[PDB]
């Protein structure tokens, strides 16, 4: 069993209320999960506002931007969820703030309230295919100059579509259609029997 | 229906940034073939271009169009300033790749599940 | 001696899972199912 | 040097 | 191993006993802030300063 | 201000695949059946849809089976049949949906195969 | 005997023709064990160059797709064990320099006629036998000569096999575009008659090799002496300053009599390591292009030749200085075409 | 393009790959773009394709030079999901290896630092030591590095029987090593010049750009999220943060220094405090088996049946768990549905951050400048690319 | 007085009290337009009227320091402006008014 | 608890001082005696073929099966080596033999594709699989660093008796 | 269930015996839930197997060896949740994480039963049923599997 403290569970719950009354028109939902962290969810029109009051607020400073992802549930109309962990070197604490973001709805970009996010939104464009207006330059980070398709996205083949090897008729690296030699064998993990939720 | 847009109202703006993106590309079509040193004709190059503008012809949504035109104009910044080099831009051309055909009785002779 | 004999393949945790084979009918030797050993009640 | 023993 | 010579040319030449430690191993409502705000670290007693 | 478009969200252009591989390509929507060999029940909860099935030659150097289809062991999992349905639409693949069929209720008590009658 | 084909067609898949190529080192090789790889075809390729030399071919074919064969043409077993389990050979074994040890009639009678006669003894379904064209048994280069001695007696030790006739070729890593860039370093480049009056018809070396390969896979071609030629014809007029023109190298035709001239491949020919110029080749240079009345090559085998101006930039860039490496085909004039 | 220059991906100055594409007036650098995803191989895609165990030796890929520390982050983030904790001694062995881990980047990033400068004997001098080091970790785990010792519930088999003697003899002794190389750069009258007033970087723009390491504590700002809060049981032992002022590459370096100092105090408490015990949970759920135990009973067999074949079967949540490695925040977003193989695994790599602000640190910079502040960010392509 | 702030960047500001008045007291101002029960009004508003209660009450800056938190008296001043601007953004933000649009249905469901 | 690292009268004393260390380079001269000093020491180096660097039992190595004292393969085929192998190596298909006992008709580590984590050897219930010792088998092509049954099992028989002695060193341990 | 165990006492073993060339009994696996003993003479008209003995050598094997002949044979396996009783064929050929399953239909009688069949790198490796209510509910013939 963690050493959990409910000291904590307590006083970030009560922050949770703070911002979701400070921020009536963004947020909607806000929990302190197990695990003791806060997740403060917001509509996607509140990036900049919400970021921007826990980057700027007496008793909520949240200074630097831990992390920038975007888990795809291809289930969830809007597929992305833009997770964005901050963390507070005042109050020593992190708060997650998550949006959703659909594939051709984009997302505005928070470069201007933390510029660490210049290289991870990047980062989302190149996996995820997530856009963030007003960013200072998004461009393919991670990918190949070429390279067609987000690769994050649950629906991308892991293995992909192109493979390069050097062609000597044309002397030149040569991408063509991937071929393997042993499928990733796709072992079915899943037991048919469930836990009862303790 | 009832879809926020992205930089276009309606595919008629749209297809505005169309046109600047096609006719950025044929100006640079020139360029490139000098600049990799690549081994193809500028006209044969230009009617590459033609071809991917219109592979995406058939969209007829405007914020799909926008996107397209973005993934666009990052293709040709890459393509200018070589950060691609002369492998990722034949790569558009397939050369080394050998084509299939699409006739029935081909595919048959060939090819379990076509 | 004993209708039922285990088989540590030999050596404990070095062996195998230990198993109990039935030697009870001389009909039939019990092998163990890891080590192919014949055993005769 | 796995084992000290010759 | 070196002869004390020898050695001592190392030890001279370095400012330190190497000999000790030797390359050769042998054998209304209050506002709430998120958490009580952080008490400033203290001054390392055994050294404040290099 | 928002705008207006009647045309089904298709996103194959912006998705990145191969032509081939999405008007070539059959996907079934379809809810796991189960084991017989086992009697859980729950891995027949949610909604896989899952790629048509490709080449699987075998490799002559090592015997092992090799594959030149992508899509093949991707399956993605959705909750409901008509989130599922969606992403087949603006994907572009052929979607076949199979209903799901789960077990008739049975009547079961213990007294009644006692009965010598019957 | 035999794989069925299965797999998409690239590399890591099967299409079942394990063939031995003894020739695979060469220029025109190169190219044939490319194809052969790509497709997926099981290639024997027997080698007498040290390792380090044979690594180039190893990276086009798949994994346990090329074996590599230790192989001596003097000693009979070599060749033995190398068809034994091939079920296609293709015999491109050739030079222009006769060698100290190997006869132009070894190179190409003798040598491969002993291969395509073990080829039989082994049962290899078809043999490609290459020989160059217009090879008269008459023709005055010794080479061409020997060369049609030899498609003759391989038709006994083999018969009803292949016999593509090759004109010279057009590559990277050729001679004909190549040696004619080089004369360069000769402040003069010598043309026998001026350069006139020995049309020739170059062809693409890909177009050579993909014909052959195709050779391997199609029952049409049994017996069948093909002539992969090209898509336009040349005086070597043009060509000699063309390729000067692509190189952006000055021409200057000199007339020289080909009886002096012989002399100077003699002088070449005299250099130990791999004369650059061969009596033998020089008259082949000036042997002009027989014209086409025989069985079709390119295109009847299946591929469309491919012009030479098309590629020529790629073969003939490595010729040009620091500036002009940078000038491309169309900017650039393309020499006329004389069928004559 | 103002001589647009890629500083090139081979170049013994880069760090394994790293093209900058540098547009430099003569030799002043203008601006510093730089590329990344040379080394991308998918690592967060393909742990989706894994079961948690399985996962393990990835983590241990994705920045090698610290080769635990990074394992010890998944271990956390994994272990918070079960709401399982592992051991007491198995703390103590992550805290003790998680410090020799810190120690060998340090002497990595230090010594590589030097080499780029152009001093070389540094390396050769604590690369001695590295050696050494390394075959702790073979005599714990087996291999020299890519150990897969830390797993999600503890470490994986407990100390051979007399290591920690030796982890004592070397720690005896290893000051002095650090104390030869300062002897050597940390007052030469040349390492300071090209190292001192060379990228400073601001307090407020370090937390801006995410800098969030020794970049951060060499600003000025203290932060070590060890002591701010605490995992496993660096919270038992007593270190100092070596802050630093006037935050440029010669001040960092000398907190990197220091913290090589700081873990040698942390190491000699571990061996002088590290608990009888077991090392794995006691949970057959999470841990595997004891092999004589899966070997005569039965239940024991299911569990390391079910445990290696299908896996921890996590429950349903998300976590981001932050650990201090020693390049900086080592952070895993790990998503989790109820499924034995995780749904996301973002690793945050304290070093995507870093390389960002090359662009504000190195302006108005000389070429030779770029060289030592790619350096002074400890940049392992693998976190980066991940 | 001090030499200069741990921080490398922030640089010692004398008058530190002066200065801090200053903008606590713009803060209140800039608040007094937030609609009534706004949310932002009353929290900060609260949160500055104790900042500077504290300010004006101690005439010593470590203590000062020490009753605000704030760690050197420099970066209170920066968290201070910093608020300043928020406060000017949030009015043009408008936070207090109803939420923009409820989630789409199922959106926040984790289990899937 | 925090450190300074580096966190800071002029007296001719004080200044000459400082001027001789700018004027007659003495610090330099400093680092230059250090690297005398070890000119002396004796150089850490081993001759690669006759001396060896030390690896204790648990090393991982070479993939070697190993067989039971009367010659029977410990591998039955439970296939659980593949299922947690992370890198997809190993390839496991099986049928009975004659003999009616379950064994693998074709064992293939791919070595190429191996990260030698040593969670096979872990996994074994029989502990068939295991790490050998050995590190040395550089290979000139590609296909011979793919390993089929009868290499490992002749791996297995080469090094039994090595194997033997650190699995029994370690066993205690696991 | 429990992480340990604490029976440090020792096991028992039954013989195993011949049912049939189609299912393997290695009945030392048994936990005597009697659901063969059912469906073979409910869903099946065998009333052939059956339990004999009581106490700790319960053991549910014919008394006299007479094979378990009959269509809708093959089911006991999919229905022993224990594996002392499999399929013979498929004795060791795979194992279920690896079998890739595609749910298709039988041929081989014109019922036309749902069934599964379970391939693993291109070859079938086994077919097992899958529930319809109205054609096949979870049972298939001896000869389509
Ligand atoms: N343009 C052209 O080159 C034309 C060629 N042809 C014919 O096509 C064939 C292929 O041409 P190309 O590849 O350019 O010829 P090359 O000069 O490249 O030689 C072909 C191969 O034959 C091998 N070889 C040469 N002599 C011997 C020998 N004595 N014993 C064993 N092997 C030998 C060489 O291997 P190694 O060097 O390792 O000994 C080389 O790899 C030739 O035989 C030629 O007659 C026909 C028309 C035009
Ligand atoms: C040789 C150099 C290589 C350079 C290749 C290049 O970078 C790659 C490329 O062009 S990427 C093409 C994608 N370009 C689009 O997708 C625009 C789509 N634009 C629309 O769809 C319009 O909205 C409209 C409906 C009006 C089209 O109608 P119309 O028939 O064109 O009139
Ligand atoms: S685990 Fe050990 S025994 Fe079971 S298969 Fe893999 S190797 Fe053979
Ligand atoms: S069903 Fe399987 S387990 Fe239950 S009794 Fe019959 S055999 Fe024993
Ligand atoms: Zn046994």
């Given at each position: 069993v963690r050493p959990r403290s409910d000291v904590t569970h307590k006083q970030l719950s009560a922050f949770g209320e703070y911002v979701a009354e400070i921020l009536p028109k963004y947020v909607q939902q806000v929990q302190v999960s197990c695990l003791d962290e806060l997740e403060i969810c917001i509509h996607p029109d509140g990036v900049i506002?919400?970021?921007?009051?826990?980057?700027?607020?007496?008793?909520?400073?949240?200074?630097?931007?831990?992390?920038?992802?975007?888990?795809?549930?291809?289930?969830?109309?809007?597929?992305?969820?833009?997770?964005?962990?901050?963390?507070?070197?005042?109050?020593?604490?992190?708060?997650?703030?998550?949006?959703?973001?659909?594939?051709?709805?984009?997302?505005?970009?928070?470069?201007?309230?933390?510029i660490a996010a210049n290289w991870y939104e990047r980062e989302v464009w190149d996996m995820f295919?997530?856009?963030?207006?007003?960013?200072?330059?998004?461009?393919?980070?991670?990918?190949?100059?070429?390279?067609?398709?987000?690769?994050?996205?649950?629906?991308?083949?892991?293995?992909?579509?192109?493979?390069?090897?050097?062609?000597?008729?044309?002397?030149?690296?040569?991408?063509?259609?991937?071929?393997?030699?042993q499928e990733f064998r796709k072992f079915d993990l899943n037991s048919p029997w469930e836990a009862f939720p303790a | 229906t009832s879809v926020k847009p992205i930089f276009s109202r309606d595919l008629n703006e749209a297809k505005r940034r169309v046109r600047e993106l096609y006719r950025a590309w044929y100006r640079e079509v020139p360029n490139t073939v000098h600049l990799m040193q690549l081994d193809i004709t500028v006209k044969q190059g230009r009617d590459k271009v033609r071809e991917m503008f219109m592979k995406n012809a058939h969209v007829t949504d405007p914020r799909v169009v926008d996107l397209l035109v973005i993934k666009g104009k990052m293709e040709l910044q890459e393509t200018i300033k070589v950060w691609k080099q002369r492998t990722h831009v034949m790569r558009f051309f397939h050369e080394t790749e050998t084509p299939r055909p699409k006739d029935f009785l081909s595919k048959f002779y060939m090819g379990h599940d076509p | 001696e004993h209708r039922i004999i285990a088989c540590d393949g030999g050596g404990?945790?070095?062996?195998?899972?230990?198993?109990?084979?039935?030697?009870?009918?001389e009909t039939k030797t019990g092998t163990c199912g890891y080590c192919g050993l014949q055993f005769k009640q | 040097c796995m084992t000290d023993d010759p | 191993s070196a002869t004390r010579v020898i050695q001592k040319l190392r030890n001279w030449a370095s400012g330190q006993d190497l000999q000790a430690k030797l390359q050769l191993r042998y054998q209304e409502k209050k506002a709430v802030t998120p958490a009580p705000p952080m008490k400033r670290w203290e001054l390392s007693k055994d050294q404040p300063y290099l | 201000q928002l705008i207006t478009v009647d045309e089904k969200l298709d996103i194959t252009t912006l998705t990145g695949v191969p032509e081939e591989h999405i008007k070539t390509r059959k996907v079934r929507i379809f809810v796991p059946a189960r084991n017989n060999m086992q009697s859980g029940v729950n891995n027949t909860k949610k909604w896989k849809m899952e790629f048509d099935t490709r080449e699987r030659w075998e490799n002559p150097l090592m015997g092992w089976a090799s594959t030149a289809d992508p899509l093949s062991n991707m399956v993605l999992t959705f909750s409901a049949k008509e989130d599922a349905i969606a992403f087949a639409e603006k994907n572009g693949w052929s979607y076949d949906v199979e209903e799901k069929k789960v077990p008739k209720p049975k009547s079961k008590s213990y007294g009644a195969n006692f009965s010598w009658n019957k | 005997?035999?794989?069925?084909?299965?797999?998409?067609?690239?590399?890591?898949?099967?299409?079942?023709?394990?063939?031995?190529?003894?020739?695979?080192?060469?220029?025109?090789?190169?190219?044939?064990?490319?194809?052969?790889?790509?497709?997926?075809?099981?290639?024997?390729?027997?080698?007498?160059?040290?390792?380090?030399?044979?690594?180039?071919?190893?990276?086009?074919?798949?994994?346990?797709?090329?074996?590599?064969?230790?192989?001596?043409?003097?000693?009979?077993?070599?060749?033995?064990?190398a068809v034994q389990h091939s079920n296609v050979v293709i015999n491109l074994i050739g030079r222009e320099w006769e060698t100290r040890n190997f006869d132009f009639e070894d190179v190409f009678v003798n040598i491969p006629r002993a291969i395509a006669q073990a080829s039989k003894e082994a049962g290899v379904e078809r043999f490609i036998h290459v020989s160059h064209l217009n090879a008269s048994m008459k023709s005055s280069s010794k080479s061409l000569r020997s060369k049609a001695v030899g498609e003759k007696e391989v038709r006994s030790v083999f018969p009803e096999a292949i016999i593509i006739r090759p004109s010279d070729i057009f590559g990277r890593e050729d001679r004909f575009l190549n040696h004619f860039a080089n004369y360069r370093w000769f402040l003069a480049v010598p043309l026998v008659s001026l350069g006139f009056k020995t049309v020739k018809q170059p062809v693409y070396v890909a177009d050579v090799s993909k014909g052959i390969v195709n050779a391997t896979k199609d029952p049409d071609a049994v017996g069948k002496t093909f002539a992969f030629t090209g898509p336009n014809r040349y005086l070597l007029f043009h060509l000699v300053k063309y390729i000067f023109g692509m190189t952006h190298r000055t021409f200057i035709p000199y007339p020289l009599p080909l009886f002096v001239y012989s002399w100077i491949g003699k002088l070449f020919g005299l250099s130990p390591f791999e004369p650059w110029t061969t009596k033998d080749k020089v008259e082949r240079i000036h042997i002009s292009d027989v014209m086409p009345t025989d069985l079709p090559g390119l295109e009847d085998l299946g591929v469309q030749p491919t012009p030479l101006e098309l590629k020529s930039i790629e073969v003939l860039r490595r010729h040009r200085t620091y500036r002009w490496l940078s000038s491309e085909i169309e900017e650039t004039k393309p020499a006329k075409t004389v069928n004559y | 393009t103002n001589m647009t220059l890629n500083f090139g991906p081979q170049h013994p100055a880069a760090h394994g790959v790293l093209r900058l594409v540098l547009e430099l007036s003569g030799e002043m650098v203008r601006k510093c773009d730089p590329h990344i995803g040379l080394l991308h191989r998918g690592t967060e895609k393909l742990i989706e394709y894994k079961t948690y165990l399985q996962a393990l030796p990835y983590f241990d890929r994705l920045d090698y030079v610290s080769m635990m520390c990074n394992?010890?982050?998944?271990?956390?983030?994994?272990?918070?999901?079960?709401?399982?904790?592992?051991?007491?001694?198995?703390?103590?062995?992550?805290?003790?290896?998680?410090?020799?881990?810190?120690?060998?980047?340090?002497?990595?990033?230090?010594?590589?630092?030097?080499?780029?400068?152009?001093?070389?004997?540094?390396?050769?001098?604590?690369?001695?030591?590295?050696?050494?080091?390394?075959?702790?970790?073979?005599?714990?785990?087996?291999?020299?590095?890519?150990?897969?010792?830390?797993?999600?519930?503890?470490?994986?088999?407990?100390?051979?029987?007399?290591?920690?003697?030796?982890?004592?003899?070397?720690?005896?002794?290893?000051?002095?090593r650090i104390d030869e190389v300062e002897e050597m750069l940390t007052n030469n009258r040349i390492w300071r010049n090209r190292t001192v007033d060379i990228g400073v970087v601001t307090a407020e723009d370090a937390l801006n750009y995410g800098f969030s390491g020794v970049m951060l504590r060499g600003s000025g700002i203290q932060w070590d999220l060890r002591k701010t809060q605490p995992y496993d049981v660096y919270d038992q032992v007593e270190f100092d943060v070596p802050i630093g002022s006037r935050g440029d590459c010669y001040d960092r370096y000398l907190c990197r220094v220091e913290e090589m100092r700081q873990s040698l105090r942390i190491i000699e408490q571990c061996l002088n405090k590290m608990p009888p015990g077991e090392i794995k949970v006691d949970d057959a759920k999470v841990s595997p088996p004891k092999r004589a135990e899966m070997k005569t009973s039965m239940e024991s067999l299911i569990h390391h049946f079910k445990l290696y074949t299908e896996g921890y079967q996590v429950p349903p949540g998300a976590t981001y768990t932050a650990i201090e490695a020693p390049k900086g925040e080592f952070g895993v977003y790990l998503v989790s549905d109820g499924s034995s193989r995780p749904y996301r695994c973002k690793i945050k790599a304290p070093g995507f951050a870093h390389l960002a602000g090359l662009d504000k640190m190195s302006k108005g910079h000389m070429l030779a400048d770029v060289v030592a502040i790619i350096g002074t960010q400890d940049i392992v392509f693998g976190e980066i690319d991940r | 007085l001090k030499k200069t702030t741990g921080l490398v960047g922030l640089a010692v500001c004398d008058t530190p009290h002066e200065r801090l008045t200053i903008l606590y007291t713009k803060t209140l101002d800039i608040l007094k337009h937030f609609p009534k029960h706004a949310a932002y009004r009353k929290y900060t508003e609260q949160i500055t009227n104790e900042k500077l209660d504290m300010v004006k009450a101690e005439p010593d800056v470590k203590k000062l320091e020490a009753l605000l938190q704030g760690g050197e008296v420099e970066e209170v001043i920066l968290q201070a402006e910093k608020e300043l601007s928020l406060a000017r953004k949030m009015l043009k933000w408008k936070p207090w008014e109803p939420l923009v649009e409820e989630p789409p249905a199922n959106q926040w469901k984790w289990p899937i | 608890t925090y450190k300074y690292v580096n966190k800071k009268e002029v007296d001719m004393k004080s200044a000459t001082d400082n001027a001789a260390r700018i004027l007659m380079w003495t610090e330099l001269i400093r680092g230059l005696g250090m690297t005398l000093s070890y000119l002396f020491r004796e150089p850490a180096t081993i001759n690669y073929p006759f001396e060896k660097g030390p690896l204790s039992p648990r090393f991982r190595g070479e993939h070697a099966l190993r067989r039971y004292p009367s010659g029977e393969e410990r591998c039955i085929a439970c296939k659980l080596c593949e299922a947690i192998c992370p890198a997809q190596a190993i390839t496991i298909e099986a049928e009975p033999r004659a003999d009616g006992s379950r064994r693998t008709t074709r064992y293939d580590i791919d070595m190429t594709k191996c990260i030698y984590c040593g969670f096979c050897q872990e996994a074994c219930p029989v502990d068939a699989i295991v790490e050998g010792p050995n590190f040395e088998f550089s290979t000139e092509t590609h296909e011979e660093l793919l390993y089929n049954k009868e290499k490992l099992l002749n791996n297995g028989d080469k090094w039994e008796a090595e194997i033997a002695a650190n699995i029994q060193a370690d066993y205690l341990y696991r | 269930g429990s992480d340990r165990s604490r029976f440090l006492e020792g096991k028992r073993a039954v013989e195993d015996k011949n049912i049939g060339p189609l299912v393997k009994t290695i009945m030392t696996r048994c936990i005597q839930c009697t659901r063969c003993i059912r469906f073979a003479s409910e869903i099946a008209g065998v009333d052939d197997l059956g339990t004999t003995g009581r106490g700790n050598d319960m053991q549910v094997g014919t008394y006299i060896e007479k094979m378990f002949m009959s269509e809708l044979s093959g089911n006991v396996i999919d229905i022993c949740p224990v594996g002392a009783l499999t399929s013979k064929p498929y004795a060791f050929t795979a194992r279920p994480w690896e079998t890739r399953k595609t749910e298709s239909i039988d041929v081989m009688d014109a019922v036309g039963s749902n069934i599964v069949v379970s391939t693993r790198t291109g070859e079938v490796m086994r077919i097992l049923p899958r529930m319809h209510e109205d054609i096949n509910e979870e049972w298939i013939s001896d000869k389509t599997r």
């Amino acid at each position: 069993v963690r050493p959990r403290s409910d000291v904590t569970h307590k006083q970030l719950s009560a922050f949770g209320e703070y911002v979701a009354e400070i921020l009536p028109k963004y947020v909607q939902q806000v929990q302190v999960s197990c695990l003791d962290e806060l997740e403060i969810c917001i509509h996607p029109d509140g990036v900049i506002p919400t970021l921007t009051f826990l980057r700027d607020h007496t008793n909520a400073q949240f200074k630097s931007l831990a992390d920038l992802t975007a888990v795809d549930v291809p289930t969830r109309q809007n597929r992305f969820e833009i997770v964005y962990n901050l963390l507070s070197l005042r109050f020593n604490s992190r708060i997650r703030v998550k949006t959703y973001a659909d594939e051709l709805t984009p997302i505005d970009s928070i470069v201007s309230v933390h510029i660490a996010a210049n290289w991870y939104e990047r980062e989302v464009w190149d996996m995820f295919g997530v856009f963030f207006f007003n960013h200072p330059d998004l461009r393919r980070i991670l990918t190949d100059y070429g390279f067609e398709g987000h690769p994050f996205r649950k629906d991308f083949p892991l293995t992909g579509y192109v493979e390069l090897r050097y062609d000597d008729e044309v002397k030149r690296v040569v991408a063509e259609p991937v071929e393997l030699a042993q499928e990733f064998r796709k072992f079915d993990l899943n037991s048919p029997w469930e836990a009862f939720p303790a | 229906t009832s879809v926020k847009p992205i930089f276009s109202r309606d595919l008629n703006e749209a297809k505005r940034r169309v046109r600047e993106l096609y006719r950025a590309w044929y100006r640079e079509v020139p360029n490139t073939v000098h600049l990799m040193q690549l081994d193809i004709t500028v006209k044969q190059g230009r009617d590459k271009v033609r071809e991917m503008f219109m592979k995406n012809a058939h969209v007829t949504d405007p914020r799909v169009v926008d996107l397209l035109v973005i993934k666009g104009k990052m293709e040709l910044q890459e393509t200018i300033k070589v950060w691609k080099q002369r492998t990722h831009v034949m790569r558009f051309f397939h050369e080394t790749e050998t084509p299939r055909p699409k006739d029935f009785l081909s595919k048959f002779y060939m090819g379990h599940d076509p | 001696e004993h209708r039922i004999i285990a088989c540590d393949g030999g050596g404990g945790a070095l062996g195998h899972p230990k198993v109990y084979i039935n030697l009870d009918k001389e009909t039939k030797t019990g092998t163990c199912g890891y080590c192919g050993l014949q055993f005769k009640q | 040097c796995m084992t000290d023993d010759p | 191993s070196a002869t004390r010579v020898i050695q001592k040319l190392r030890n001279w030449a370095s400012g330190q006993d190497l000999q000790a430690k030797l390359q050769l191993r042998y054998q209304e409502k209050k506002a709430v802030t998120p958490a009580p705000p952080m008490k400033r670290w203290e001054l390392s007693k055994d050294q404040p300063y290099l | 201000q928002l705008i207006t478009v009647d045309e089904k969200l298709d996103i194959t252009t912006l998705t990145g695949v191969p032509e081939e591989h999405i008007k070539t390509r059959k996907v079934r929507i379809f809810v796991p059946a189960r084991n017989n060999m086992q009697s859980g029940v729950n891995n027949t909860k949610k909604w896989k849809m899952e790629f048509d099935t490709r080449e699987r030659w075998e490799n002559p150097l090592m015997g092992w089976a090799s594959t030149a289809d992508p899509l093949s062991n991707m399956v993605l999992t959705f909750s409901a049949k008509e989130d599922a349905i969606a992403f087949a639409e603006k994907n572009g693949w052929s979607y076949d949906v199979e209903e799901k069929k789960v077990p008739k209720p049975k009547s079961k008590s213990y007294g009644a195969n006692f009965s010598w009658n019957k | 005997h035999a794989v069925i084909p299965h797999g998409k067609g690239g590399r890591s898949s099967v299409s079942g023709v394990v063939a031995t190529v003894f020739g695979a080192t060469g220029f025109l090789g190169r190219y044939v064990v490319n194809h052969l790889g790509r497709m997926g075809s099981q290639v024997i390729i027997p080698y007498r160059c040290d390792v380090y030399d044979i690594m180039h071919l190893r990276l086009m074919g798949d994994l346990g797709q090329l074996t590599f064969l230790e192989w001596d043409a003097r000693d009979k077993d070599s060749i033995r064990k190398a068809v034994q389990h091939s079920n296609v050979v293709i015999n491109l074994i050739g030079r222009e320099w006769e060698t100290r040890n190997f006869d132009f009639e070894d190179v190409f009678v003798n040598i491969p006629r002993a291969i395509a006669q073990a080829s039989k003894e082994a049962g290899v379904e078809r043999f490609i036998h290459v020989s160059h064209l217009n090879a008269s048994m008459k023709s005055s280069s010794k080479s061409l000569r020997s060369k049609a001695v030899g498609e003759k007696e391989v038709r006994s030790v083999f018969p009803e096999a292949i016999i593509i006739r090759p004109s010279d070729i057009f590559g990277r890593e050729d001679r004909f575009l190549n040696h004619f860039a080089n004369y360069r370093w000769f402040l003069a480049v010598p043309l026998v008659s001026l350069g006139f009056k020995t049309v020739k018809q170059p062809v693409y070396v890909a177009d050579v090799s993909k014909g052959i390969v195709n050779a391997t896979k199609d029952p049409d071609a049994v017996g069948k002496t093909f002539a992969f030629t090209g898509p336009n014809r040349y005086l070597l007029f043009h060509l000699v300053k063309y390729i000067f023109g692509m190189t952006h190298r000055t021409f200057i035709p000199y007339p020289l009599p080909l009886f002096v001239y012989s002399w100077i491949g003699k002088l070449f020919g005299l250099s130990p390591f791999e004369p650059w110029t061969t009596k033998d080749k020089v008259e082949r240079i000036h042997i002009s292009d027989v014209m086409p009345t025989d069985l079709p090559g390119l295109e009847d085998l299946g591929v469309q030749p491919t012009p030479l101006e098309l590629k020529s930039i790629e073969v003939l860039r490595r010729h040009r200085t620091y500036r002009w490496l940078s000038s491309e085909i169309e900017e650039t004039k393309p020499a006329k075409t004389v069928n004559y | 393009t103002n001589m647009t220059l890629n500083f090139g991906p081979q170049h013994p100055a880069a760090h394994g790959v790293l093209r900058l594409v540098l547009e430099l007036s003569g030799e002043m650098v203008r601006k510093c773009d730089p590329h990344i995803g040379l080394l991308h191989r998918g690592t967060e895609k393909l742990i989706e394709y894994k079961t948690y165990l399985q996962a393990l030796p990835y983590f241990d890929r994705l920045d090698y030079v610290s080769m635990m520390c990074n394992e010890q982050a998944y271990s956390i983030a994994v272990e918070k999901l079960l709401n399982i904790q592992p051991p007491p001694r198995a703390q103590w062995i992550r805290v003790l290896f998680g410090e020799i881990t810190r120690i060998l980047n340090h002497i990595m990033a230090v010594t590589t630092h030097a080499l780029d400068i152009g001093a070389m004997t540094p390396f050769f001098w604590m690369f001695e030591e590295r050696e050494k080091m390394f075959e702790f970790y073979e005599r714990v785990s087996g291999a020299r590095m890519h150990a897969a010792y830390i797993r999600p519930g503890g470490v994986h088999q407990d100390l051979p029987l007399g290591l920690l003697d030796d982890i004592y003899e070397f720690s005896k002794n290893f000051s002095l090593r650090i104390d030869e190389v300062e002897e050597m750069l940390t007052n030469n009258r040349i390492w300071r010049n090209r190292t001192v007033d060379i990228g400073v970087v601001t307090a407020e723009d370090a937390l801006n750009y995410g800098f969030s390491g020794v970049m951060l504590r060499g600003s000025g700002i203290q932060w070590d999220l060890r002591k701010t809060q605490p995992y496993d049981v660096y919270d038992q032992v007593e270190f100092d943060v070596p802050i630093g002022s006037r935050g440029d590459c010669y001040d960092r370096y000398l907190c990197r220094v220091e913290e090589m100092r700081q873990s040698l105090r942390i190491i000699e408490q571990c061996l002088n405090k590290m608990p009888p015990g077991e090392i794995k949970v006691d949970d057959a759920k999470v841990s595997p088996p004891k092999r004589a135990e899966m070997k005569t009973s039965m239940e024991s067999l299911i569990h390391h049946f079910k445990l290696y074949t299908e896996g921890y079967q996590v429950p349903p949540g998300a976590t981001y768990t932050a650990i201090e490695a020693p390049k900086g925040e080592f952070g895993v977003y790990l998503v989790s549905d109820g499924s034995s193989r995780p749904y996301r695994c973002k690793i945050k790599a304290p070093g995507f951050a870093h390389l960002a602000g090359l662009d504000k640190m190195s302006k108005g910079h000389m070429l030779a400048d770029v060289v030592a502040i790619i350096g002074t960010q400890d940049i392992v392509f693998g976190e980066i690319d991940r | 007085l001090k030499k200069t702030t741990g921080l490398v960047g922030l640089a010692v500001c004398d008058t530190p009290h002066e200065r801090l008045t200053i903008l606590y007291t713009k803060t209140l101002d800039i608040l007094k337009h937030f609609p009534k029960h706004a949310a932002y009004r009353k929290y900060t508003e609260q949160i500055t009227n104790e900042k500077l209660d504290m300010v004006k009450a101690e005439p010593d800056v470590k203590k000062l320091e020490a009753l605000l938190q704030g760690g050197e008296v420099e970066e209170v001043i920066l968290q201070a402006e910093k608020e300043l601007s928020l406060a000017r953004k949030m009015l043009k933000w408008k936070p207090w008014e109803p939420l923009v649009e409820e989630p789409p249905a199922n959106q926040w469901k984790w289990p899937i | 608890t925090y450190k300074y690292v580096n966190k800071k009268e002029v007296d001719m004393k004080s200044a000459t001082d400082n001027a001789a260390r700018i004027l007659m380079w003495t610090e330099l001269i400093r680092g230059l005696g250090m690297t005398l000093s070890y000119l002396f020491r004796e150089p850490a180096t081993i001759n690669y073929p006759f001396e060896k660097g030390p690896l204790s039992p648990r090393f991982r190595g070479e993939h070697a099966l190993r067989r039971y004292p009367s010659g029977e393969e410990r591998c039955i085929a439970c296939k659980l080596c593949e299922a947690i192998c992370p890198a997809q190596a190993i390839t496991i298909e099986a049928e009975p033999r004659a003999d009616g006992s379950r064994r693998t008709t074709r064992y293939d580590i791919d070595m190429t594709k191996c990260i030698y984590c040593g969670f096979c050897q872990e996994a074994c219930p029989v502990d068939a699989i295991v790490e050998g010792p050995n590190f040395e088998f550089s290979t000139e092509t590609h296909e011979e660093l793919l390993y089929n049954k009868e290499k490992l099992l002749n791996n297995g028989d080469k090094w039994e008796a090595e194997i033997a002695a650190n699995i029994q060193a370690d066993y205690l341990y696991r | 269930g429990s992480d340990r165990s604490r029976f440090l006492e020792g096991k028992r073993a039954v013989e195993d015996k011949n049912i049939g060339p189609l299912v393997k009994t290695i009945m030392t696996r048994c936990i005597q839930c009697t659901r063969c003993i059912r469906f073979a003479s409910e869903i099946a008209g065998v009333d052939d197997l059956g339990t004999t003995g009581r106490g700790n050598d319960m053991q549910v094997g014919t008394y006299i060896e007479k094979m378990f002949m009959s269509e809708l044979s093959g089911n006991v396996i999919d229905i022993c949740p224990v594996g002392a009783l499999t399929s013979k064929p498929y004795a060791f050929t795979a194992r279920p994480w690896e079998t890739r399953k595609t749910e298709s239909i039988d041929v081989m009688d014109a019922v036309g039963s749902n069934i599964v069949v379970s391939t693993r790198t291109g070859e079938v490796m086994r077919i097992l049923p899958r529930m319809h209510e109205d054609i096949n509910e979870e049972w298939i013939s001896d000869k389509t599997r």
